[PDB]
Symmetry: C2
Subunit: 70 residues, 2 copies
Amino acid sequence: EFQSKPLLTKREREVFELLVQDKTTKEIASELFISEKTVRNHISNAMQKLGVKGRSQAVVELLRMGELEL
Amino acid sequence: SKPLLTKREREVFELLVQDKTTKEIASELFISEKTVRNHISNAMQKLGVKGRSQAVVELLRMGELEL
Protein backbone atom coordinates (compact mmCIF):
# COMPACT_ATOMS: atom_id res chain seq x y z
CA GLU A 1 0.00 0.00 0.00
CA PHE A 2 1.82 3.20 0.98
CA GLN A 3 4.74 1.80 2.93
CA SER A 4 8.05 1.77 1.06
CA LYS A 5 9.59 -1.52 0.00
CA PRO A 6 11.96 -3.17 2.48
CA LEU A 7 15.55 -2.16 2.10
CA LEU A 8 16.62 -5.79 1.53
CA THR A 9 15.66 -7.64 -1.65
CA LYS A 10 13.99 -11.01 -1.14
CA ARG A 11 17.22 -13.00 -1.62
CA GLU A 12 19.26 -10.68 0.62
CA ARG A 13 16.75 -11.39 3.41
CA GLU A 14 16.89 -15.16 2.82
CA VAL A 15 20.68 -15.07 3.09
CA PHE A 16 20.52 -13.06 6.33
CA GLU A 17 17.91 -15.31 7.92
CA LEU A 18 20.25 -18.26 7.23
CA LEU A 19 23.26 -16.28 8.46
CA VAL A 20 21.65 -15.82 11.92
CA GLN A 21 21.09 -19.58 12.20
CA ASP A 22 24.83 -20.07 12.09
CA LYS A 23 25.10 -21.33 8.54
CA THR A 24 28.38 -20.80 6.65
CA THR A 25 28.32 -19.23 3.26
CA LYS A 26 28.81 -22.69 1.62
CA GLU A 27 25.80 -24.09 3.47
CA ILE A 28 23.70 -21.05 2.47
CA ALA A 29 24.74 -21.47 -1.16
CA SER A 30 23.84 -25.17 -1.07
CA GLU A 31 20.47 -24.46 0.59
CA LEU A 32 19.48 -21.66 -1.74
CA PHE A 33 20.86 -23.46 -4.88
CA ILE A 34 23.18 -20.58 -5.87
CA SER A 35 26.95 -20.05 -5.96
CA GLU A 36 28.98 -18.90 -2.96
CA LYS A 37 29.99 -15.78 -4.90
CA THR A 38 26.30 -14.94 -5.20
CA VAL A 39 25.81 -15.33 -1.39
CA ARG A 40 28.80 -13.01 -0.77
CA ASN A 41 27.47 -10.56 -3.37
CA HIS A 42 24.11 -10.42 -1.54
CA ILE A 43 25.81 -9.85 1.84
CA SER A 44 28.04 -7.16 0.34
CA ASN A 45 25.15 -5.32 -1.31
CA ALA A 46 23.08 -5.33 1.82
CA MET A 47 25.94 -3.96 3.89
CA GLN A 48 26.62 -1.20 1.32
CA LYS A 49 22.92 -0.29 1.54
CA LEU A 50 23.11 -0.05 5.36
CA GLY A 51 26.44 1.74 5.13
CA VAL A 52 28.14 -0.57 7.60
CA LYS A 53 31.53 -2.30 7.38
CA GLY A 54 30.80 -5.57 9.12
CA ARG A 55 28.32 -8.42 9.19
CA SER A 56 27.70 -7.98 12.94
CA GLN A 57 26.61 -4.38 12.37
CA ALA A 58 24.47 -5.40 9.37
CA VAL A 59 22.63 -7.92 11.57
CA VAL A 60 22.13 -5.46 14.39
CA GLU A 61 20.86 -2.69 12.07
CA LEU A 62 18.59 -5.06 10.16
CA LEU A 63 17.19 -6.20 13.52
CA ARG A 64 16.62 -2.59 14.54
CA MET A 65 14.88 -1.89 11.25
CA GLY A 66 12.48 -4.89 11.44
CA GLU A 67 13.98 -6.30 8.23
CA LEU A 68 15.18 -9.52 9.89
CA GLU A 69 13.71 -11.49 12.74
CA LEU A 70 15.63 -14.12 14.78
CA SER B 1 22.92 -23.48 27.40
CA LYS B 2 24.07 -20.44 29.43
CA PRO B 3 27.80 -19.60 28.94
CA LEU B 4 29.10 -16.74 31.13
CA LEU B 5 31.05 -13.79 29.72
CA THR B 6 33.60 -11.90 31.84
CA LYS B 7 33.22 -8.16 32.35
CA ARG B 8 35.72 -7.38 29.60
CA GLU B 9 34.25 -9.81 27.09
CA ARG B 10 30.80 -8.26 27.57
CA GLU B 11 32.20 -4.73 27.28
CA VAL B 12 33.83 -5.63 23.95
CA PHE B 13 30.54 -6.93 22.52
CA GLU B 14 28.61 -3.97 23.93
CA LEU B 15 31.00 -1.72 22.00
CA LEU B 16 30.93 -3.95 18.94
CA VAL B 17 27.21 -3.46 18.47
CA GLN B 18 27.74 0.33 18.52
CA ASP B 19 29.59 0.11 15.19
CA LYS B 20 33.13 0.37 16.54
CA THR B 21 36.05 -1.41 14.89
CA THR B 22 38.60 -3.28 17.02
CA LYS B 23 40.89 -0.30 16.73
CA GLU B 24 38.25 1.87 18.41
CA ILE B 25 37.39 -0.69 21.02
CA ALA B 26 41.07 -0.99 21.90
CA SER B 27 41.22 2.82 22.24
CA GLU B 28 38.13 3.11 24.44
CA LEU B 29 38.98 0.31 26.82
CA PHE B 30 42.70 1.30 26.95
CA ILE B 31 44.14 -2.08 25.84
CA SER B 32 45.81 -3.42 22.68
CA GLU B 33 43.92 -4.51 19.57
CA LYS B 34 45.40 -7.93 20.14
CA THR B 35 43.74 -8.06 23.58
CA VAL B 36 40.44 -7.01 22.00
CA ARG B 37 40.69 -9.88 19.50
CA ASN B 38 41.56 -12.25 22.37
CA HIS B 39 38.45 -11.25 24.31
CA ILE B 40 36.35 -11.74 21.14
CA SER B 41 37.80 -15.21 20.40
CA ASN B 42 37.37 -16.39 23.99
CA ALA B 43 33.79 -15.16 23.98
CA MET B 44 33.11 -16.97 20.66
CA GLN B 45 34.54 -20.20 22.09
CA LYS B 46 32.33 -19.88 25.19
CA LEU B 47 29.33 -19.40 22.96
CA GLY B 48 30.12 -22.30 20.64
CA VAL B 49 30.04 -20.16 17.46
CA LYS B 50 32.25 -19.49 14.43
CA GLY B 51 32.14 -15.70 13.85
CA ARG B 52 31.40 -12.29 15.42
CA SER B 53 27.91 -11.95 14.03
CA GLN B 54 26.95 -15.39 15.34
CA ALA B 55 28.29 -14.38 18.82
CA VAL B 56 26.17 -11.24 18.77
CA VAL B 57 23.10 -13.19 17.73
CA GLU B 58 23.60 -15.79 20.50
CA LEU B 59 24.13 -13.09 23.13
CA LEU B 60 20.93 -11.34 21.94
CA ARG B 61 19.10 -14.62 22.30
CA MET B 62 20.32 -15.16 25.88
CA GLY B 63 19.53 -11.59 26.93
CA GLU B 64 23.16 -10.57 27.50
CA LEU B 65 23.10 -7.79 24.93
CA GLU B 66 20.57 -5.09 24.15
CA LEU B 67 20.17 -3.07 20.99
